[PDB]
């Protein structure tokens, strides 16, 4: 539910930092996608 | 062509924004709350270790003091 | 008197023949007189946490007790001094030793002896007169600003058997002699006080007056009271100097104390280089701010106990000046570095860790320090008020406030000037993030504003609302653009822009913004919010009309008033009289009222 | 009868270590007895014997050990445990953390001396609490009703207005004669003024007793501070038949005192470095509550605690949550929107609301209204969490009504003035006026009879 | 019948309370009654075992609990069952034991929960998310199980 | 059979000796009496908990999680009593069983065991909640002797190849199952959807046994090839094309 | 040659196997032979050092390992290298050391792994992801490294 429940270890801290960088990178890549789509979408509407 | 493009872009924006907000409000919060639990319980194991090592060190000092007293 | 070293292991020195010694008593160890605190007693033996590196201490070395716990020498000759965290005088160590180094085991007396100070005895006193702790038995002219009130130590009392006549006396001359229960006490200008003990008071008063910083955001939107407890997120990227220098040059505190809690070597030398060169105008003369401060500096390689003590030393100094009836301000430029020193002591004592590896008593050691602030009625008979304001910076790693020193600090301080790297990168000085920041003293200051600035509480409330509305409206602007907003909301963004760009920003390097008086600050905000109310009335009065007021109409027909609302920041209390300044503000109120009246 | 034997005094301090002084040569040491220590400078201090072994007595010193000396320290052993002097004359008075007076009145002229630890209330003689107290606050009285004799704490994030809620409850508390014992552990002086002032402003002094331990007062006194307050409450309730309310402020500062003492003692640590017995010690405070057979008296408790880093899973709220009869929660998600009092119903419960409601106590509908308000507020939070991902365009009209309910609910049910007093019956009429936002058939927690008696009115 | 030992009653007596409850239950089982035993928390029992260990200075396992915690719980829950009683008349007694573990922080990684779920054949894991929703009984139907179902199918 | 029983009500310390008695009987039966022996050790966690009980009572220095530091050598004196020996026909096979605390594969008991034992058979909560009996998750399971137990004359010669490919396909199956949530079902390609079908059919036909079905190795590899046949031939990339031409077109 | 300690051999024999191995390897290195040596895992040696340290009542440092674990590993790995052998026929032997390092639970933050990485110039980082996809020989080409490239360029 609120957490992934990997068992507490320095391995799991590394894996969760990696998962955080993964998810934050995914957010940034998809934010660029959303911005580029939004620009074209508003251009097309005016056309 | 503008109509089909516009309608397709609207759906693609909704799909993309659902993923962006699911990352921002589900995936990242599960990970950050997990990482807080991992850092917390990792520190709990570090305290439980510290306490055992400290109590061992005190018993050793008692045994050394007793061993010197036994010379009298 | 002295004991002998029995054993050494790192900084821990066990001593013997210490049967007369006390817990936390201060001891000099070895032929070099290394400082340390007794952390345990076990019979006729004592375990001393030696502060300095013990390399070379030997079994059978002397162990000289001081008759005192860790304590601050208080007296004249504090102003201009530089101290380490344990009150050793870094300027005088330098001048006597002629060395770039502190020698291990300094014994230099903290207040410089041999300086005959000019002393005037309190002219009301006589032989046979009654006296109690905190009575001012004479005044020492140590510097032009700070007339040093010599006072009876808080625990001393009795009848004056002698007082020295007017003259020049050094700190070891017996200025007062008194008797109680048939026992004489000889007394000096130097006074010794246990650093971890609160200097007592007649009463801690509720704090009720602004500690004016001379800075628009800090004085208007997030006020700190005289006696207030406050924090700053002191980190490089945020520009922390904008508060601390402004307080040091201008603020309404009679004395200042700095504690370097455990700062980086070069960052410590910035403080020690800078402050000598800073100046204040007093009675139309210009003088160095070192006339009214002492710098308790500590680099990160100062002894752990000196870093942990340094905070308590600075407040123990500040409480002595508070007891002289002065308003002290105390800056503590990284409570986090002090909490690390505290954590190192706990680690060396082999105590159990608590939150994030800090000791259990971190909460208590922070809280029992911040509770040493406040206004007071002093001890002793001339009824004088005074205060200490504590401005204790925090340094949360990555900005994460869940860090226990930061979280416990924000659990205690009533004001938090949340400086932010995003504002500092944009040069939005003083760089305070108004969404993060807060003050709890607003209620208590209502008495002061009601008496002296009666319209200002409305203006402050409206300002905070306009800024909060800017952040809420910015979401709508990001969703659907500025064009999609209501006219009320468009003018709200324009006034919020004036508030953010020309009220809250203040470039302290410019001659006009070096300082900003509270009357100038009120007049500026009064005009921006008067424009807001008149624009909002004009818009709302023309709601559902044929002809309708909007920001573009206002900017077309009265863009001069928008230009003046920005331009008012340039008015100068040095070149312009108060009447001229107030009159220009009153004229802009009339100008804007006529300008809006021409529209609706 | 009085102890007739004369007191021994010892200089045999065989050591000092942290907050402990270790006497030796003691004649028949008594566990938990009180020592009075005179330091070399003539300062008086007090302490309690934490361990005894042969000739040795390990005394913990309340004022701390700074200045204790291995030769020149005189330890007078009183030969008995710590007793609080108690009397009804303690109402209208103020005491420090060790129970010395600070109102400039005299010492407590005792009607009796009571053991500060109290006695375990016999489970056969404990009455199950059921008469309702109105606090006057809708988020309590409408959805978290407090029984006469319940213990139910106010949890809060740090810097929330929990002191104001607790003050308001002291102003507005009543049945649908009374007295308060207020204690604060490690309270800052700015807040100590607020509490003392509020009782003076409400005219309450003649039936409140204050124990103040300030945030700079010696941290071991925090351990006895709530125990003194309870020992006074026990005298007033169980001997004098007063209807007592005990307020214990920042049980977090109490738990910090346990953590500090635990570190100094070297106890086995539980979670976050609190002692492994933190539950029992918190029970020794909290369980001194409730009604007792044959007595008209009652101890109510409303403890308050600052949840560290807002964490509900932290040992302080968590062990308190196990011991106490539900909890009242205050939230930044209400306070940042200026919703005073910032009480969040959703995590809140009161275990005795399942009895201190219904005929003779409150209106018949109360239980049903409370449960339906809980369902609608919870669903409102769930659809708000959906909106944050997929936007309001994905929500149904029913889901949008639960989101609008969550807005109207906070604006009217939770929101209340700091001096505004509302009855439970008024709170239920507000409850129905909110429930009327939905069509009758959606009210799945309310029976058809309760709907027929109350929904259209 | 009740065996009280409330949270403020002496810590040590929690051990005696549990052992008293199962001793009674084994006696009513030997009469041939289908006993049930409630225990309001094995974790508050295990906290008595933690306290005695900490006073004796025994080495802790996880979270301060004594290393024999597993064996104490094992030799408690194994006092359950259906039994052919001792002695002449045959009887089919039982004790059913229901230990309401109270994991500190709500976290099922708690050593008492972990040891308890090692021994018990039925696990009714409650969940604060359900209790916050006022979904009562707050049983989480994902994490819960009953190993007896294959025998009960008959 | 030969049964030693220490139950959860029997005294803790006996269970330290119980596994050593069993293995000593197994050494007599195997290495002196030529029996092929299987040894079952029903809960190595309860054995390690017995070591933790005595170790704590001896005040010994702990290893991680408070177990005795010597538990690795000690568990080795148990697990290393296995395998064929010179001149003997007899052989001690062992299949120990081990209750992982907190479901944690890295717990000191399974961790030190995994270093000593010749793989592990890993039974997973996820497969059990899906009612898959036996719940063996093939991915975290390993067998170090597998590479010499299987091959021509020991099994059908294809058995290594079919098993290697199925194992990679299951791993890809779990990865595309993670994609179905993280990126959504709509992001999956036709190939990824075939790995997802493989994962479902694999649990249903390969993993799911039933408690009295005694499948031969031949029935197992035959079901294996019937599952690998789901993909286009070119997707079976780990298998040599010679083996594919013999067993894919079936 | 092989030195062979099954895991049940006494803890000190596990330590001796490492020092025997390197001393044999150094003996053939002195003949001018380019010896290679492989260890089954330096972590299994560190598990021997842990158990020895615990039994001696030493203060551990991390996860029960002795603080001198790094110095032990250095007194092993720093016996490698090419050498100009002692005595009269000028010859250049070498000992190559392939010291394996599977960490507890697979955690590459582990003390014996980190201490090994502080000493070895090459790290063949085998990876579960490649092994699970049955890619062989399973070396992760983004985590692995070899500092020797600077020399081999000649």
Extract the tokens encoding G104: 């507890």
Chains D and A touch (3+ CB pairs under 8 A): no
Q: Which residue has the tokens 């008015």?
A: C571
Counts of helices then strands in chain G (DSSP H, E):
6, 7
Q: How far is residue E139 from each of residues C577, E125, E127, E136, F140, measured CA to CA in Å?
A: 76, 6, 6, 7, 30
Extract the tokens encoding C298: 């500590």
For chain C, the helix, strand and coil percentages under 3-state DSSP, each to the nearest 5:
35, 25, 40
Total length of chain G: 154
SS3 F123: strand
Extract the tokens encoding A37: 């789509």
Ordered DSSP codes for D385-445: HHHHHH-GGGS-HHHHHHHHHHHHHIIIII---TT----HHHHHHHHHHHHTTS-GGG-TT
Interface check C361 vs D, CB under 8 A: yes
Interface check C350 vs B, CB under 8 A: yes
Q: Distance between CA C250 and CA C157 in Å, rounded?
A: 38
Interface check G129 vs A, CB under 8 A: no
Cis peptide before D341 (omega within 30 of 0): yes
> E69 with E111: CB under 8 angstroms?
yes
SS3 E140: coil
Q: What is the DSSP letter of C59?
A: T
- Output the CA torsion sign for C414, C415, C418, C419: negative
Q: D266 vs B48: CB contact, 8 Å cut-off?
A: no
Q: Distance between CA D275 and CA F63 in Å, rounded?
A: 23
Domains delineated in chain C: 1-70 (no CATH), 71-114+188-439 (3.40.50.300), 115-187 (2.40.50.100), 440-600 (no CATH)
Q: Distance between CA F88 and CA B48 in Å, rounded?
A: 49
Q: Distance between CA F227 and CA F94 in Å, rounded?
A: 31
Q: Distance between CA D103 and CA D92 in Å, rounded?
A: 9
Instruction: Confirm whether residue G136 is marked as ligand binding.
Output: yes
To which H or E segment does residue D348 belong? strand D343-350
Cis peptide before C430 (omega within 30 of 0): yes
> C493 with C559: CB under 8 angstroms?
no
> G107 with F106: CB under 8 angstroms?
yes
Extract the tokens encoding D160: 């929330």
CB contacts < 8 A (B, F): 12
Q: F77 vs G58: CB contact, 8 Å cut-off?
A: no
* Residue from D155, D269, D274, D276 to probe the interface with E (highest E Cβ count within 10 Å): D276
Q: Distance between CA D323 and CA C534 in Å, rounded?
A: 58
3-state secondary structure D27-53: CCCCCCEEEEEECCCCCEEEEEEEEEE
Extract the tokens encoding C157: 């009392």
Q: Distance between CA F64 and CA F52 in Å, rounded?
A: 11
Name every residue whose Cβ is closer than 8 Å to that of residue B22 and which is 6 or more positions away in sequence: D389
Residue D103 β-bridge partners: none
Q: From the annotation, which residues of C make up the binding site for ADP?
A: 237-242, 264, 429, 506, 508
Q: What is the DSSP letter of E104?
A: G
Q: Classify strands C183-187 and C176-180 as parallel, antiparallel or unpaired.
A: antiparallel
Q: Distance between CA D330 and CA D347 in Å, rounded?
A: 9
| Chain Cα centroid distance, residue B70 | 49
CA distance F104 to chain A (A): 7
CA distance B71 to chain D (A): 22
Q: Distance between CA G105 and CA F102 in Å, rounded?
A: 14
The stretches of chain G forming alpha helices (DSSP H) are 11-29, 42-55, 69-77, 111-117, 128-132, 149-152
> D16 with D65: CB under 8 angstroms?
yes
Total length of chain E: 154
| Chain Cα centroid distance, residue D344 | 18
> C37 with C6: CB under 8 angstroms?
no
Q: Which residue has the tokens 């049903």?
A: D368
Name every residue whose Cβ is closer than 8 Å to that of residue D292 and which is 6 or more positions away in sequence: D121, D125, D126, D127, D238
The rounded radius of gyration (Å) of the Cα atoms in chain A is 18
Domains delineated in chain D: 2-457 (3.40.50.12240)
| Residue whose C-alpha is closest to residue D325's, from D274, D277, D287, D370 | D287
Q: From the annotation, which residues of C make up the binding site?
A: 237-242, 263-264, 267, 333, 429, 506, 508
Method of determination used here: cryo-EM
Q: Distance between CA D184 and CA D191 in Å, rounded?
A: 10
SS3 F18: helix
Q: Distance between CA D286 and CA D230 in Å, rounded?
A: 9
Instruction: Kindly list the residues of chain F whose beta carbon comes within 8 Å of any beta carbon in chain A.
Output: 102-104, 106-107
Ordered DSSP codes for D177-215: -EEEEEEEEEE-HHHHHHHHHHHHHTTGGGGEEEEEEET
The stretches of G56-110 forming alpha helices (DSSP H) are 69-77
* Residue from B34, B45, B55, B61 to probe the interface with E (highest E Cβ count within 10 Å): B55
> G59 with B57: CB under 8 angstroms?
yes
Name every residue whose Cβ is closer than 8 Å to that of residue G6 and which is 6 or more positions away in sequence: F76, F80
* B13 vs A6, A24, A34: nearest CB: A34
- The strands making up C167-169's β-sheet, listed across from edge to edge, are C148-151, C136-140, C117-121, C167-169
Q: Which residue of B has its CA nearest to A31?
A: B20
Q: Distance between CA C323 and CA C307 in Å, rounded?
A: 25
Q: Which residue has the tokens 């919703």?
A: D339
CA distance F110 to chain B (A): 19
Q: Which residue of F has its CA nearest to B44?
A: F65
> G80 with G97: CB under 8 angstroms?
yes
> E76 with E97: CB under 8 angstroms?
yes
Ordered DSSP codes for C342-411: HHHHHHHTTPPP-GGG--TTHHHHHHHHHTT-EEEEPSSTT--EEEEEEEE----GGG-TTSHHHHHHHT
> D140 with D348: CB under 8 angstroms?
no
CA distance D42 to chain E (A): 35
Extract the tokens encoding C193: 């006080």
- Output the CA torsion sign for C266, C268, C269, C274: positive
* Residue from F27, F52, F60, F64 to probe the interface with G (highest G Cβ count within 10 Å): F64
SS3 B58: helix
Ordered DSSP codes for A1-47: --S----SSHHHHHHHHHHHHHHHHHHHHHHHHHHHHHHHHHHHHH-
| Residue whose C-alpha is closest to residue C385's, from C227, C228, C214, C229 | C227
| Residue whose C-alpha is closest to residue C4's, from C30, C35, C42 | C30
Q: Distance between CA D254 and CA D284 in Å, rounded?
A: 13
> C334 with C340: CB under 8 angstroms?
no
Q: Which residue of B has its CA nearest to F63?
A: B49
> B51 with D268: CB under 8 angstroms?
yes
Q: How far is residue A22 from each of residues A17, A30, C245, G140, measured CA to CA in Å?
A: 9, 12, 43, 19
Q: Distance between CA C329 and CA B30 in Å, rounded?
A: 45
> D196 with D94: CB under 8 angstroms?
yes
Interface check G105 vs A, CB under 8 A: yes
| Residue whose C-alpha is closest to residue C415's, from C388, C386, C452, C389 | C389
Extract the tokens encoding D329: 């929660």
SS3 B3: helix
Name every residue whose Cβ is closer than 8 Å to that of residue D126 and which is 6 or more positions away in sequence: D290, D291, D292, D293
SS3 D173: coil
Name every residue whose Cβ is closer than 8 Å to that of residue D441 and which is 6 or more positions away in sequence: none
Q: D266 vs B58: CB contact, 8 Å cut-off?
A: yes
Cis peptide before G137 (omega within 30 of 0): yes
Q: C44 vs D70: CB contact, 8 Å cut-off?
A: yes
* Exposed e or buried b per residue across G107-118, where buried means at least 16 C-beta atoms within 10 angstroms of its C-beta: beebbbbbbbee
CA distance B8 to chain A (A): 9
Q: Distance between CA G147 and CA G120 in Å, rounded?
A: 9
In chain B, what residues touch G60 (CB-CB under 8 Å)?
53
CA distance D214 to chain E (A): 27
Q: How far is residue G30 from each of residues G22, G36, G93, G96, measured CA to CA in Å?
A: 12, 13, 6, 13
To which H or E segment does residue F137 belong? none
* Residue from G5, G56, G64, G108 to probe the interface with F (highest F Cβ count within 10 Å): G64
> C335 with C374: CB under 8 angstroms?
no
Q: G64 vs F70: CB contact, 8 Å cut-off?
A: no
Extract the tokens encoding C508: 């302290």
Chains F and A touch (3+ CB pairs under 8 A): yes
In chain F, what residues touch A25 (CB-CB under 8 Å)?
none
| Residue whose C-alpha is closest to residue D345's, from D380, D321, D316 | D380
> D59 with D20: CB under 8 angstroms?
yes
Extract the tokens encoding C326: 């002065």
Extract the tokens encoding C170: 């050094």
* Backbone φ/ψ region at C187: left (φ over 0), alpha (ψ -120 to 50), beta: beta
> D174 with D326: CB under 8 angstroms?
no
Q: B18 vs D389: CB contact, 8 Å cut-off?
A: yes
Q: Distance between CA C85 and CA C94 in Å, rounded?
A: 16
In chain F, what residues touch E66 (CB-CB under 8 Å)?
56
Q: Distance between CA C479 and CA C481 in Å, rounded?
A: 6
Interface check B64 vs F, CB under 8 A: no
The stretches of F6-145 forming alpha helices (DSSP H) are 14-27, 44-57, 71-79, 108-116, 125-129
Q: B30 vs A4: CB contact, 8 Å cut-off?
A: yes
Q: What is the DSSP letter of C545?
A: S
| HSE, side-chain direction, 13 A CA sphere, residue G43 | 21
Name every residue whose Cβ is closer than 8 Å to that of residue G73 and which is 6 or more positions away in sequence: G42, G46, G112, G115, G116, G119
Interface check B61 vs F, CB under 8 A: no
CB contacts < 8 A (B, D): 21
Interface check A8 vs F, CB under 8 A: no
Interface check G128 vs F, CB under 8 A: no
* Residue from G5, G7, G12 to probe the interface with F (highest F Cβ count within 10 Å): G7
Q: Classify strands D74-81 and D33-38 as parallel, antiparallel or unpaired.
A: antiparallel
Q: D323 vs E7: CB contact, 8 Å cut-off?
A: yes
Burial class (CB in 10 A: 0-12, 13-18, 19+), C59: exposed
| HSE, side-chain direction, 13 A CA sphere, residue D324 | 30
CA distance B44 to chain D (A): 7
């Amino acid at each position: 539910k609120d957490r992934i429940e990997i068992f507490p270890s320095r391995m799991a801290q590394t894996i969760m930092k990696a998962r955080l960088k993964g998810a934050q990178t995914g957010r940034n890549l998809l934010k660029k996608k959303s911005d580029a789509l939004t620009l074209r979408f508003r251009q097309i509407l005016k056309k | 062509s503008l109509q089909t493009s516009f309608v397709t872009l609207d759906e693609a924006i909704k799909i993309t924004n659902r993923r962006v907000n699911a990352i921002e409000h589900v995936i990242i919060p599960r990970i950050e709350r997990t990482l807080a639990y991992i850092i917390t319980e990792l520190d709990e194991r570090e305290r439980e270790e510290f306490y055992r090592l400290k109590k061992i060190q005190e018993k050793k000092k008692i045994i050394k003091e007793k061993s010197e007293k036994d010379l009298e | 008197t002295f004991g002998y070293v029995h054993g050494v292991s790192g900084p821990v020195v066990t001593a013997c023949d210490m049967a007369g010694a006390a817990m936390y008593e201060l001891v000099r160890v070895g032929h070099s007189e290394l400082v340390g605190e007794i952390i345990r007693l076990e019979g006729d033996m004592a375990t001393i946490q030696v502060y300095e590196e013990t390399s070379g201490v030997s079994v059978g070395d002397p162990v000289l007790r001081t008759g005192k716990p860790l304590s601050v020498e208080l007296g004249p000759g504090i102003m201009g001094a530089i101290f380490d965290g344990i009150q050793r005088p870094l300027s005088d160590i330098s001048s006597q030793t002629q060395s770039i180094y502190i020698p291990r085991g300094v014994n230099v007396s903290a207040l410089s002896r041999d300086i005959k100070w000019e002393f005037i005895p309190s002219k009301n006193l006589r032989v046979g007169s009654h006296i109690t702790g905190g009575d001012i038995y004479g005044i020492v002219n140590e510097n032009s600003l700070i007339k040093h009130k010599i006072m009876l130590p808080p625990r001393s009392r009795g009848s004056v058997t002698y007082i020295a006549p007017p003259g020049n006396y050094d700190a070891s001359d017996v200025v007062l002699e008194l008797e109680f229960e048939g026992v004489k006490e000889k007394l000096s200008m130097v006074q010794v006080w246990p650093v971890r003990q609160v200097r007592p008071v007649t009463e801690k008063l509720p704090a009720n007056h602004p500690l004016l910083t001379g800075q628009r955001v800090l004085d208007a939107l997030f006020p700190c009271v005289q006696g207030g407890t406050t924090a700053i997120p002191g980190a490089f990227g945020c520009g922390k100097t904008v508060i601390s220098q402004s307080l040091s040059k201008y603020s309404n505190s009679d004395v200042i104390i700095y504690v370097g809690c455990g700062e980086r070597g070069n960052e410590m030398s910035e403080v020690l280089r800078d402050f000598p060169e800073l100046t204040m105008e007093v009675d139309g003369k210009v003088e160095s701010i070192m006339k009214r401060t002492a710098l308790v500096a500590n680099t990160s390689n100062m002894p752990v106990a000196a870093r942990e003590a340094s905070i308590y030393t600075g407040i123990t100094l500040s409480e002595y000046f508070r007891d002289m009836g002065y308003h002290v301000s105390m800056m503590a430029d990284s409570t986090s570095r002090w909490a690390e020193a505290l954590r190192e002591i706990s680690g060396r004592l082999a105590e159990m860790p608590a939150d994030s590896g800090y000791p259990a008593y971190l909460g208590a050691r922070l809280a029992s320090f911040y509770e040493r602030a406040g206004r007071v009625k002093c001890l002793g008979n001339p009824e004088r008020e005074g205060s200490v304001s504590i401005v204790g910076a925090v340094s949360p790693p990555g900005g994460d406030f869940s860090d226990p020193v930061t979280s416990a600090t924000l659990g205690i301080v009533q004001v938090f000037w949340g400086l932010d790297k995003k504002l500092a990168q944009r040069k939005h000085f003083p760089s305070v993030n108004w969404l993060i920041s807060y003050s709890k003293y607003m209620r208590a200051l209502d008495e002061y504003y009601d008496k002296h600035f009666t319209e200002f509480v409305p203006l402050r409330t409206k300002a905070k609302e306009i800024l909060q509305e800017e952040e809420d409206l910015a979401e709508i602007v990001q969703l659907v653009g500025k064009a999609s907003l209501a006219e009320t909301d468009k003018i709200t963004l324009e006034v919020a822009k004036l508030i953010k760009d020309d009220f809250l920003q203040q470039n302290g390097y410019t001659p006009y913004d070096r300082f900003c008086p509270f009357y100038k600050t009120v007049g500026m905000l009064s005009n921006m919010i008067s424009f807001y109310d008149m624009a909002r009335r004009a818009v709302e009065t023309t709601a559902q009309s044929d002809n309708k007021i909007t920001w573009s109409i206002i900017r077309e027909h009265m863009g001069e008033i928008l230009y003046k609302l920005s331009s008012m920041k340039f008015k100068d209390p040095v070149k312009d009289g108060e009447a001229k300044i107030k009159a220009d503000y009153a004229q802009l109120l009339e100008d804007m009222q006529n300008a809006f009246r021409s529209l609706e | 009868n009085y102890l007739s034997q004369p007191r021994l005094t010892y200089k045999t301090v065989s050591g000092v270590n942290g907050p402990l002084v270790i006497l030796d040569h003691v004649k028949f040491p008594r566990y938990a007895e009180i020592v009075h220590l005179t330091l070399p400078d003539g300062t008086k201090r007090s302490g309690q014997v934490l361990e005894v072994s042969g000739s040795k007595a390990v005394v913990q010193v309340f004022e701390g050990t700074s200045g204790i000396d291995a030769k020149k320290t005189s330890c007078e052993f009183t030969g008995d445990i710590l007793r609080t002097p108690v009397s009804e004359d303690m109402l209208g008075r103020v005491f420090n953390g060790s129970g010395k007076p600070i109102d400039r009145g005299p010492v407590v002229l005792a009607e009796d001396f009571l053991d500060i630890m109290g006695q375990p209330i016999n489970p056969q003689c404990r009455i199950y609490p059921e008469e309702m107290i109105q606090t006057g606050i809708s988020a309590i009285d409408g959805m978290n009703s407090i029984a006469r004799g319940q213990k139910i704490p106010i949890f809060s994030a740090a810097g929330l207005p929990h002191n104001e809620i607790a003050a308001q409850i002291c102003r507005q508390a009543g049945l649908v004669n009374f007295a308060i014992v207020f204690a604060a552990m490690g309270v800052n002086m700015e807040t100590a003024r607020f509490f003392k002032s509020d009782f003076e402003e409400n005219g309450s002094m003649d039936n409140v007793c204050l124990f103040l331990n300030l945030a700079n007062d010696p941290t071991i006194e925090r351990i006895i501070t709530p125990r003194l307050a309870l020992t006074t409450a026990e005298f007033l309730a169980y001997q004098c038949e007063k209807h007592v309310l005990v307020i214990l402020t920042d049980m977090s500062s109490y738990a910090e005192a346990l953590r500090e003492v635990s570190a100094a003692r070297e106890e086995v640590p539980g979670r976050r470095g609190f002692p492994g017995y933190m539950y029992t010690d918190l029970a020794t405070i909290y369980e001194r509550a409730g009604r007792v057979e044959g007595r008209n008296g009652s101890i109510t408790q409303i403890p308050i605690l600052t949840m560290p880093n807002d964490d509900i899973t932290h040992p302080i709220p968590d062990l308190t949550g196990y011991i106490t009869e539900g909890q009242i929660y205050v939230d930044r998600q209400l306070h940042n929107r200026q919703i005073y009092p910032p009480i969040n119903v959703l995590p809140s419960l009161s275990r005795l609301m399942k009895s201190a409601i219904g005929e003779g106590m409150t209106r018949k509908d109360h239980a049903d209204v409370s449960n339906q308000l809980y369902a609608c507020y919870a669903i409102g939070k769930d659809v708000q969490a959906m909106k944050a991902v997929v936007g309001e365009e994905a929500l149904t009209s029913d889901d949008l009504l639960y989101l609008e309910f969550l807005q109207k609910f906070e604006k009217n049910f939770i929101t209340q003035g700091p001096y505004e007093n509302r009855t439970v019956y008024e709170t239920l009429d507000i409850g129905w006026q909110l429930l009327r936002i939905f069509p009758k058939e959606m009210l799945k927690r309310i029976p058809q009879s309760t709907l027929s008696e109350f929904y259209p009115r």
